[PDB]
Amino acid sequence: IIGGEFTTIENQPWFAAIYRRHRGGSVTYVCGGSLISPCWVISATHCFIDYPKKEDYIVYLGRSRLNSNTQGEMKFEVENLILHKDYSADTLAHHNDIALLKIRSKEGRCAQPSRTIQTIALPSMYNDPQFGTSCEITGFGKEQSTDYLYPEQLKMTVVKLISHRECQQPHYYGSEVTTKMLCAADPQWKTDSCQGDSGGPLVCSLQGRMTLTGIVSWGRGCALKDKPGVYTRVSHFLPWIRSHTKE
Numbered sequence: 001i002i003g004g005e006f007t008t009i010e011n012q013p014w015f016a017a018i019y020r021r022h023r024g025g026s027v028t029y030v031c032g033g034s035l036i037s038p039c040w041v042i043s044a045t046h047c048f049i050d051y052p053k054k055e056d057y058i059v060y061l062g063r064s065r066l067n068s069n070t071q072g073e074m075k076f077e078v079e080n081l082i083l084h085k086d087y088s089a090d091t092l093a094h095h096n097d098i099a100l101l102k103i104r105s106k107e108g109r110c111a112q113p114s115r116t117i118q119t120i121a122l123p124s125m126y127n128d129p130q131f132g133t134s135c136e137i138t139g140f141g142k143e144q145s146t147d148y149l150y151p152e153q154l155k156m157t158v159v160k161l162i163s164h165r166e167c168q169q170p171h172y173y174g175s176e177v178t179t180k181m182l183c184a185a186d187p188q189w190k191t192d193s194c195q196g197d198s199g200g201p202l203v204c205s206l207q208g209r210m211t212l213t214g215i216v217s218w219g220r221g222c223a224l225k226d227k228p229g230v231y232t233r234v235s236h237f238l239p240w241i242r243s244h245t246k247e
């Protein structure tokens with residue numbers, strides 16, 4: 001998250017922090033995600049495609065910090081890593097960049113809600129705010145593009161929804177951007193998602209409810225003029241999500 005501000009998990013209690021175990025046993029951060037129900041975290045497929053095996057992943061809920069534990073956090077394994085069959089990666093653009101992780105504890109349970117761990121509503125089908133709407137994005141991604149380190153403290157910022165039509169332009173993304181994607185950006189290109197924020201939430205207030213409108217997916221650089229952040233448009237994948245979150 002370029003710009004924006006520091007936050008804690010109370011202000012985004014559905015945010016999930018996804019890590020992977022390396023052979024040799026170091027644990028490194030992967031991406032964010034969003035808890036949509038007690039046993040289901042939603043994220044991007046690109047976070048996972050190179051290491052598609054569900055036993056290497058660890059998911060924390062209720063965690064505000066990168067490399068230190070937060071009081072009341074819950075730690076999970078991935079009983080289940082579900083990647084979108086139609087995924088596709090071009091140079092930048094990732095298509096169908098959506099993934100479901102079914103979480104379970106060593107004790108075999110899902111999330112128990114708390115002050116620091118709640119779920120986020122999906123939008124209803126093909127229902128998104130109008131362009132120019134202000135939404136929030138959350139993550140542990142880089143604070144500046146040149147950084148080597150990721151912030152130890154969770155961050156969020158505000159970006160505004162850009163029309164399919166604006167984002168369509170040459171000087172923007174041309175045809176890299178589909179109607180299954182959403183663009184969002186700051187009017188001064190001042191603040192943005194960046195490397196490491198992938199998989200986490202773009203949350204818009206939609207009919208006065210906090211709604212998971214987008215999932216951080218890609219962009220050319222960060223906080224670059226004419227180069228918005230690109231988000232998977234959740235309201236075009238509800239059947240995929242509905243089918244894949246069952247028995």
Ligand SMILES: Nc1nc2ccc(C(=O)NCC(=O)O)cc2s1
Nearest residue numbers: 193194195196198218219221229
């Ligand atoms: N809005 C975004 N800008 C960028 C720039 C770079 C990257 C990127 O390379 N990320 C690696 C990663 O996914 O963490 C992701 C984004 S998402």
